[PDB]
């Protein structure tokens, strides 16, 4: 009960900033996550013993893929931490509990392949879940792990509180399906601009939590340029493996996934920042003004990709 996690001074200060990088020491990521649950939620939110056992089971069910890995899970949870800490009073006790857990779990048992590749391969998961195929699987893996003995971190919640938190985690994880992001942000755009946006409306909260999930999920584009650039290498390492697998099924992959079209990555990054990232963090900043450093950092990284195209790097 009187047992705080404390980080070295550089980490203690920099973990509070949106652009923090969790570093290359895998063995510190669990302690980093617990530190964030404790400051974000409280030292009473979870039984330390159960939490530690849940974290280590989650780690074990992430795979050794270049991008959709345990580092990604903790990085996405850290961006959520920064959002929650900069918007103290906007979120319920259950939302604060549920969202860091959702983020840690949001890519559980990812194989480094997109929903499309599962559908073209005719993977069993694509018959069990016709849309948001991997995201429904990630939620399913979350429920599995919560049900392992000694793993129920929510054990002290009431029956209805428990159902509300699993329902926050489900929607939060489903929303990380980027196919859903576009419509979600358009609706939020209109509600904000016509002044209809209402955070006491549960369906409105749901959309706002969804946009936060997209924002945390994409947070590599809000880091310092060397983090952003090296993370994009991991992203394409997965995409190009998927492209190779498409070619094995006899299908020309989209260029994004075709390693033969490496040269076009910089232009593809501009498309991505303009079509996805910038609009995401813009709408987020409109709804939650203290998230502005994500928009500012994203703009800086867009300008770095523009310099890449101009041959200035
Ligand atoms: C940086 N970041 N963070 C998450 C993700 C991500 O998409 N996902 C899904 C798993 C994570 C990314 C990311 O880089 N995506 C690739 C962006 C992208 N690359 C290309 C492209 C085209 C041709 C040749 C080479 C590259 N086009 N394109 C694009 C263009 C317009 C609209 C959408 N995408
Ligand atoms: Mg995902
Ligand atoms: Zn993700």
From Swiss-Prot:
3',5'-cyclic GMP binds at residues 68, 269. 3',5'-cyclic AMP binds at residues 68, 269. Changing residue 107 to A: Loss of activity and of zinc binding. A divalent metal cation 1 binds at residues 72, 106-107, 217. Residues 1-312 form the PDEase domain. It is found in: Cytoplasm, Cytosol. The active site is at residue 68. It comes from the Eukaryota. Abundant in the putamen and caudate nucleus regions of brain and testis, moderately expressed in the thyroid gland, pituitary gland, thalamus and cerebellum. A divalent metal cation 2 binds at residue 107. The tandem GAF domains bind cAMP, and regulate enzyme activity. The binding of cAMP stimulates enzyme activity. Composed of a C-terminal catalytic domain containing two divalent metal sites and an N-terminal regulatory domain which contains one cyclic nucleotide-binding region. Belongs to the cyclic nucleotide phosphodiesterase family. Homodimer. Plays a role in signal transduction by regulating the intracellular concentration of cyclic nucleotides. Can hydrolyze both cAMP and cGMP, but has higher affinity for cAMP and is more efficient with cAMP as substrate. May play a critical role in regulating cAMP and cGMP levels in the striatum, a region of the brain that contributes to the control of movement and cognition. It is linked to Dyskinesia, limb and orofacial, infantile-onset: An autosomal recessive, early-onset hyperkinetic movement disorder characterized by axial hypotonia, dyskinesia of the limbs and trunk, orofacial dyskinesia, drooling, and dysarthria. The severity of the hyperkinesis is variable. Striatal degeneration, autosomal dominant 2: An autosomal dominant disorder characterized by striatal degeneration and dysfunction of basal ganglia, resulting in hyperkinesis. This is cAMP and cAMP-inhibited cGMP 3',5'-cyclic phosphodiesterase 10A. It comes from Homo sapiens. The gene is PDE10A.
